[PDB]
Amino acid sequence: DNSTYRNLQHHEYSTYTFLDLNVELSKFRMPQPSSGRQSPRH
Amino acid sequence: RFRGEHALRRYPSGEERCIACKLCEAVCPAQAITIEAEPRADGSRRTTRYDIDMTKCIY
Amino acid sequence: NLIEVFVDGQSVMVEPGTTVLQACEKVGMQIPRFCYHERLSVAGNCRMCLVEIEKAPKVVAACAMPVMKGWNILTNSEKSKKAREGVMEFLLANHPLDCPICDQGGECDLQDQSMMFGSDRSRFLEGKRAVEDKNIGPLVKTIMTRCIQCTRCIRFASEIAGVDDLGTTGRGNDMQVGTYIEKMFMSELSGNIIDICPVGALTSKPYAFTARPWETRKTESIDVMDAVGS
Amino acid sequence: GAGGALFVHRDTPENNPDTPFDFTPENYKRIEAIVKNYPEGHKAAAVLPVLDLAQRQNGWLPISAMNKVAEILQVPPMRVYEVATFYTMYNRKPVGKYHIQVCTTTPCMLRNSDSILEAIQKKLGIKVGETTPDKLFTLIEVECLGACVNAPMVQINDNYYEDLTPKDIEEIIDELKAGKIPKPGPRSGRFSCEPAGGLTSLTEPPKGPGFGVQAGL
Amino acid sequence: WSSTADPLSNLVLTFSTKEDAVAFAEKNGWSFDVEERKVPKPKSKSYGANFSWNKRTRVSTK
Amino acid sequence: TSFGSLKDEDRIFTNLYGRHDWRLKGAQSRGDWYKTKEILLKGPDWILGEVKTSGLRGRGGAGFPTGLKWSFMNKPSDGRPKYLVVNADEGEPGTCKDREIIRHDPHKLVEGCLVGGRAMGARAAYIYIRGEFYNEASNLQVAIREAYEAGLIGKNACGSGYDFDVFVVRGAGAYICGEETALIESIEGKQGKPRLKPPFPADVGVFGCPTTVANVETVAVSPTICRRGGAWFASFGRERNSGTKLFNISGHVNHPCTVEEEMSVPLKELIEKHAGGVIGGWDNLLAVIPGGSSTPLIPKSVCETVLMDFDALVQAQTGLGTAAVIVMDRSTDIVKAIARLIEFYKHESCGQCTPCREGVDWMNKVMARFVKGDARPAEIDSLWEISKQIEGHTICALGDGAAWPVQGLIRHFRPELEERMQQFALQHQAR
Numbered sequence A: 001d002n003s004t005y006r007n008l009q010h011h012e013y014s015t016y017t018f019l020d021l022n023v024e025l026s027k028f029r030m031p032q033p034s035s036g037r038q039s040p041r042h
Numbered sequence B: 001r002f003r004g005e006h007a008l009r010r011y012p013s014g015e016e017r018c019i020a021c022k023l024c025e026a027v028c029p030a031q032a033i034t035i036e037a038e039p040r041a042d043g044s045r046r047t048t049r050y051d052i053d054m055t056k057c058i059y
Numbered sequence C: 001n002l003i004e005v006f007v008d009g010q011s012v013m014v015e016p017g018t019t020v021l022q023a024c025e026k027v028g029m030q031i032p033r034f035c036y037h038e039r040l041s042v043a044g045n046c047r048m049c050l051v052e053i054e055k056a057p058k059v060v061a062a063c064a065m066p067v068m069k070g071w072n073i074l075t076n077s078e079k080s081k082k083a084r085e086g087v088m089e090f091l092l093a094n095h096p097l098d099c100p101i102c103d104q105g106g107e108c109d110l111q112d113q114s115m116m117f118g119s120d121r122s123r124f125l126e127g128k129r130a131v132e133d134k135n136i137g138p139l140v141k142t143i144m145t146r147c148i149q150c151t152r153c154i155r156f157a158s159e160i161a162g163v164d165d166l167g168t169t170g171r172g173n174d175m176q177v178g179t180y181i182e183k184m185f186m187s188e189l190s191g192n193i194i195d196i197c198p199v200g201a202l203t204s205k206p207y208a209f210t211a212r213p214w215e216t217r218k219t220e221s222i223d224v225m226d227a228v229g230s
Numbered sequence D: 001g002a003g004g005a006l007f008v009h010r011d012t013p014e015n016n017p018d019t020p021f022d023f024t025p026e027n028y029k030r031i032e033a034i035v036k037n038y039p040e041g042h043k044a045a046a047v048l049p050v051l052d053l054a055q056r057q058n059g060w061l062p063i064s065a066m067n068k069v070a071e072i073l074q075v076p077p078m079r080v081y082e083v084a085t086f087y088t089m090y091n092r093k094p095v096g097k098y099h100i101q102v103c104t105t106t107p108c109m110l111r112n113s114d115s116i117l118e119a120i121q122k123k124l125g126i127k128v129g130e131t132t133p134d135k136l137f138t139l140i141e142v143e144c145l146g147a148c149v150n151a152p153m154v155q156i157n158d159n160y161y162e163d164l165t166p167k168d169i170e171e172i173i174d175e176l177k178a179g180k181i182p183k184p185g186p187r188s189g190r191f192s193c194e195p196a197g198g199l200t201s202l203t204e205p206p207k208g209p210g211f212g213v214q215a216g217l
Numbered sequence E: 001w002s003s004t005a006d007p008l009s010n011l012v013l014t015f016s017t018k019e020d021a022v023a024f025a026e027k028n029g030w031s032f033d034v035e036e037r038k039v040p041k042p043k044s045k046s047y048g049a050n051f052s053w054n055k056r057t058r059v060s061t062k
Numbered sequence F: 001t002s003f004g005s006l007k008d009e010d011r012i013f014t015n016l017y018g019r020h021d022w023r024l025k026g027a028q029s030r031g032d033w034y035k036t037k038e039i040l041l042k043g044p045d046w047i048l049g050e051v052k053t054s055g056l057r058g059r060g061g062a063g064f065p066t067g068l069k070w071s072f073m074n075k076p077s078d079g080r081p082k083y084l085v086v087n088a089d090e091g092e093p094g095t096c097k098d099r100e101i102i103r104h105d106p107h108k109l110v111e112g113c114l115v116g117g118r119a120m121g122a123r124a125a126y127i128y129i130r131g132e133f134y135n136e137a138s139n140l141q142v143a144i145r146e147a148y149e150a151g152l153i154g155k156n157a158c159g160s161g162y163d164f165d166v167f168v169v170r171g172a173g174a175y176i177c178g179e180e181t182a183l184i185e186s187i188e189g190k191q192g193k194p195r196l197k198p199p200f201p202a203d204v205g206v207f208g209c210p211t212t213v214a215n216v217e218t219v220a221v222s223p224t225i226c227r228r229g230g231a232w233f234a235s236f237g238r239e240r241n242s243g244t245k246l247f248n249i250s251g252h253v254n255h256p257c258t259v260e261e262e263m264s265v266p267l268k269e270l271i272e273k274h275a276g277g278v279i280g281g282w283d284n285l286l287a288v289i290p291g292g293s294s295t296p297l298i299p300k301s302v303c304e305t306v307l308m309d310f311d312a313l314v315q316a317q318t319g320l321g322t323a324a325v326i327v328m329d330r331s332t333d334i335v336k337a338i339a340r341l342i343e344f345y346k347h348e349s350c351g352q353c354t355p356c357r358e359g360v361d362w363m364n365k366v367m368a369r370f371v372k373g374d375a376r377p378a379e380i381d382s383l384w385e386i387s388k389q390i391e392g393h394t395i396c397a398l399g400d401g402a403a404w405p406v407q408g409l410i411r412h413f414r415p416e417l418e419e420r421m422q423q424f425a426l427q428h429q430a431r
Ligand SMILES: Cc1cc2nc3c(=O)[nH]c(=O)nc-3n(C[C@H](O)[C@H](O)[C@H](O)COP(=O)(O)O)c2cc1C
Pocket: F057, F058, F059, F060, F061, F062, F063, F064, F066, F069, F087, F088, F089, F090, F091, F092, F098, F175, F176, F177, F178, F179, F180, F181, F213, F214, F215, F216, F218, F396, F397, F398
């Protein structure tokens, strides 16, 4: 039970794994706060 | 160390050593040096006028 | 209401939010500075304005530190003098030996503040850094080996002139100021970077090599190119 | 030590504002996901993620890619250039297919990291700042990579190869050039940071939920 | 060289007060024009203003 | 009283070494995500009190009371969002503990983020992870997705009515961006140059909003302290140095590793027990860096009896730092090792301050001349003085941390520098 390395899921990640996961997570997020302007240059 | 007549020197290449920095004009006790400068055709900082009044110079 | 602070033991009544540098100015003491301009934002990166507070073990940046109630500012203390000497040592350690060929000449803040607040000798026994010269148009001449990375031109460009074409590229000792591309900084307010640059990194190109500051006589007139009457 | 890479841009036929670069539709979806991680009015916070995405798509960062990121995020191109030149994970120059990065800081230097570097240089026949003639491998030195206990180690395209010996790194390079992808991790029989001799801690099974919980909590 | 015929070309006098300068000019009989001293006005400087949440004072670079 | 011999039942970071499942099922098999709703219902003041009683100090460098920090954060709102920023830019040369925590205990990290955000009244937590830790960041994102799906974070987190978001932002290469204000500047898409204090991050942080920056280890041990006591945590360790610690023993040691131990375990015991001792035995020890590159070194004389502890190491003219123990045996070039450290700091200096920028480059050149002996004995005091000029005069603490290794080398190995200078002079004197 304490002899095998179980962190083997990471020998499959590709370049876009992190960003694809970020895309998948977008629906669970909450609305972002707004500073009232579109940009500090506005 | 003797101080006689003045001269403007050159580098071994023949280029003038003076870069028109006007330190001599500033330090001259007798106000005997007059200097005017401008960028040369190759962009060098060089003098166009360098006068010494040897009747005003205190050597 | 106004709070009370002390500069070298003398009482000053200053509004909250006033900085150490401004309080010393109020009592008449001008703290040395390179990156601080009162018309621009506060950077606090040259570390030339470090002063000692009475009980603080650490020096503070006078240009960016608001005064607290009952602070004693030791403007001529041993800690402040040594801090200024160290900062000036670093600046002159990497600066180039270009004073005779530099238009900043007798009107240079590095020279004047080195004669006033720095040491008279050099401990730097290494090689210096040489920086490639950028080109930003026909008005401003850039000799960027003399830059002290005070970022006044960046702040001025951005905030005052509304042009964000200047910045710092890279990091470390090899950090450079410029555009990163061959772009000309052309604006109706472009010579003011010549004015605010404390060193000879930015110099006037029409005025190049023509005169020295002590020679010139100053006549106070007004401008007639427009109806502002500058 | 001089870096050797200049922080000014000179227009070239392969690298100029007219160089074709634009994000794929999938990458635009990813950009849209990234941008809405930050408050409204602070869209400029996405400069690092979007620039990294552009480099991930294009292999490196041309000036056209930088200008495209600036255009998408409505941020000054000089601000994008500042970020790109500041951060060392961005490739502003074309790089090899495999970017070998040998860590040479003191914890990795105490173990024979110079042997690893020399083995790589002899195996590939390149210096420590050059690319192979077939544009397949690039070799550089880097600072601490966070695997100090697994020293010496290299990173090859965001994979850590750890506890290396010259033979191990030569085998890794051989697998890379043949076509296979070597498994990341230690090559010395370890699985992770645990001591090689044997587990000196965490030998018994972990305690269950609510083991030593407080009274009220 | 640059010539002159004006004796008072390089003459500059230093006074501690406007009243002293005016009295000197009046007793020596010259005409005079007085310019009121210009001092910079106090300014509100805030480092924290560089990082405003909703105001335009937020700087794009350091 | 003696310290050490921590028990596996009392080690906080189980699943270290990755021998168990790191997913939600495995994490919940251990104590993670247990009565988190009850903790949140207890609320901010109770969590702050528990942390203050536990006496936890900052685990990512400067050891500052985390209860006091989060109390600074606990002021009433004023119409701005509130953020917890979890620092995971583990750039310190010798430190891998944050990597292990992210890679094998991501749900512990996420639960700690939720607990700290509730304590500080924060709507969101940005986890700033360094860009080389790509696989670690991906594992973290997988754990966060599992938590969102299980309802542990997000809207009505843990069924408590508290909305809390967890984002993961990947940096690029910048040991300086590891710094708190540089971390904030990096998140905002800027260069990543430290700010001046004031304003403090609790007043103007990321996006100009109140933020608290906390280390991965600190936030990860937070929920275990809340669920357990904190009288327990204070029981582990000395009086003002309480709890457990992750030590990364590396360098000239037989079995380099990452271990968890008590806060006041003696250095010699730790090395001899968890790492197999120095390579040639304890007699072969030359020097130890006990807190990563920033902290000075100590000779074998100090290492003979010294406690791997904040105050204990400060009294030895050092610091605990990140508890990254780099061991150098007698068959090493100590001058060259310190020169490589100074070169590291030269490459990682952000260049904002004249002191750090110019002086760190200057010290790099002087050390490079020292390692070959191409110097004079009168340049040792000059180097000491310029390092003293850098320290305390810089915007951030990288300037201070670039001077302490130089000071430690000068303090404990000046005869070696002088002997090397003498040998070089003799080599040149021959011709
Ligand atoms: C991974 C990491 C890297 C750090 N790097 C630096 C650094 O380069 N320079 C510095 O002055 N402080 C550095 N620090 C310390 C931070 O300024 C700050 O103490 C820490 O991020 C949060 O404090 P705390 O966790 O002790 O509460 C680092 C901290 C962490 C966690």
